[model samples]
Target: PATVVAGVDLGDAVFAAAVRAGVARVEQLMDTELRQADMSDSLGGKRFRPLFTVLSAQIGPQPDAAAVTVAGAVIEMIHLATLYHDRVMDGNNVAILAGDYLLATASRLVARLGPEAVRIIADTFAQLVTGQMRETVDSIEQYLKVVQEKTGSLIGAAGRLGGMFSGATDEQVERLSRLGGVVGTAFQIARDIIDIDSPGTDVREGVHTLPMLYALRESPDCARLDDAEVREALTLLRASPGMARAKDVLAQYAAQARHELALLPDVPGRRALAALVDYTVSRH
Candidate 1:
C-alpha cells in the first residue's frame, strides 16, 4: 500500500537523484526532438524497477553509487518506454516518437551502467517486443506464456539490475530474478481478479483472466459477453468455485515470492521487499 521501504520511497536518495536526472534528460531529449508537442509537465512515479535495483545493490558493499543510480534509472526508463508504446498502440500518434526517444535515451543510461549490463537490457527489449507481438492465445498455456513475457520480463529485469549492479553473488542474482518473476506474475493475477470484481471491464474485449477461464471451463454457468453484461457473468462466476480456485493460484505465487525475500541475506531492504509482495497481492 505504501511505496516507502527502509526509509526509501521507491528510490533511495542517491538512486532517486539518478532517476530525476535520467527523466530530465529524457524530457530534454523529447523537447529537443520536437518542441511542438510540448508535454512539459509529465513524470509518472517509476515503480518496482528502481526499488528492486536499489535494494539489491545494498546486498554487498556500499554501492558504486552513481553506477547503481544509472542502473535504477535505466530500468525505470525502459519501463517508461513501454508505456508510450502502449499509448501509440491505443492510437496516440505522438506516443511513437516519445517511445522511441525514451528507448534511445535509456540506451545511453544502460551504457553508463556498464557494457556487460547492455546485453541484459537488449535481450529484455527483444522479449518485450516478441511478447507484444503475440496477441493470439490458442490455449491456457499460451496465455500464461504471454503473461510471463509481458509482465514477468520487466520485473525480472529490475531484479537483475539490482543484483548485478550491487555485486551480489551469482546465486543471489538468480534468486532475485526469480523473485521478480513470481512477484510480478502474482501482481498481474491480483489485477485479473480485481478486474472480474469490477463492472467496467470483461473478457469479450479480449480480456479473459485465469478466473474467468476457469469459470467458463468448469462452471458452465458463464455465457458469451456479447449476450450478457459483465456484472451478470460475474454473478454466475462468483456463485461458482472459480474465484476460490483463482485465489488458490494467487496464494501460491505470493507465498513463493515472499519466500524469496526470506532466503536473501537478512537486510532491511529485504523486509521492505517482502512488504512489497504483500502489497502486490493485496492491492485491489
Candidate 2:
C-alpha cells in the first residue's frame, strides 16, 4: 500500500509533473510585469520547488488553475516566512549558527516589494516568531500550540488553501483544515518518537508526548526519574514490558489519524492521505 502511492512509478512521475505545473502556474500568477524586481530568483523560489511537489501531491490538481496557482504561492510564501525567522531564533553561536545569510536574503527580497508586500511578510513572520517565543516560554502548555502554528500551519494552509483553489465549498475547506491538523499532529508525534532522546524542543522541555505520557501512566516508577533517569526508562522500554505498551499508544494515534481521513470523501487523493498514516506507523 505504501509503495502504491509514493513508490508507484507513474504516481511519482505524476507528483513531480503536477508540482512543476503548479510552479508554472504560480509564476504566471505573479506575472513579471507586476513584480517591481525579479523576486522569483531568490531563495524563496528554490525552497518552494520541493514544497510545491509535496503540496500538489497531497492536495491533488484543481480545475481552477489560477486559484490553485495563487494558493500554492501563498502557502510557499508562508513557509518561507517561517524559515526566515526560524534561522534567526534557533541559530546559536556554536551549534546552530543564526541563519543570518538566509534571513538576510529573504529580507532583501521582501524589501524589494512594495510597502504592502513588506507589511504582509512582516506580519506573517511575526506569527511564526511570536508562536516560537511563546512555545519557548511556556514550553508545556504551548507544545501543541507551537506545533500548530509553526508546523501545522503550513499543512493546514496547504489543504485549506488548496480547497479554496479548487472552488470547494466552505464546508469542504473546513473539513480539509481539520484533516490537515490531525495529520500534522500525527506527523509531529512521529517526530517526537525519533527525537525522544533530545532533551530540548517542546516535546522534551514542554509537554509529555504519547510515549512518555503512556509510560508515565503505566509505570509510576518513571515519575521518580530525572532527565537521565527518564532516558534510562526509555532504554528499558525498548526491551521491557513497557515497550509493548508504548507501541500500543503509537498504534492508537496512527489509527486516529486514519479515522480522520476516513471522514473525508473517498477519492484517490484521500486514499493517498490515508496511506500517509500507515507510512508513519510502519516507521516504528
Q: Which candidate is the best by lDDT?
A: 1
TM-scores, in order shown?
0.79, 0.57
Query: Lowest-lDDT window of 10 residues in candidate 2?
Result: 1-10
Q: What would the per-residue lDDT of candidate 2 be over residues 1-284, giving only the tens digit for each residue?
A: 22232322224556546644556665554344234542332242332322322443344345456545545555554455455555455424421222333344444544543464355446545656667776653333356567666665555555665555555556766666666555555566666665553334223543455455445545336533256665665564344444455556556656766776766655555655555555555542
lDDT of 1 at 255: 85
What is candidate 1's CA lDDT for residue 64?
59
Q: Model 1, 77-142: lDDT tens per residue?
A: 677777787655633666776767778777876877676789888988887887788733445566
lDDT (Cα, 0-100) at 51 in candidate 1: 59
Tell me how far the alpha carbon of residue 123 in candidate 2 is from the true structure, in angstroms, after superposition: 9.6
lDDT of each: 0.68, 0.51
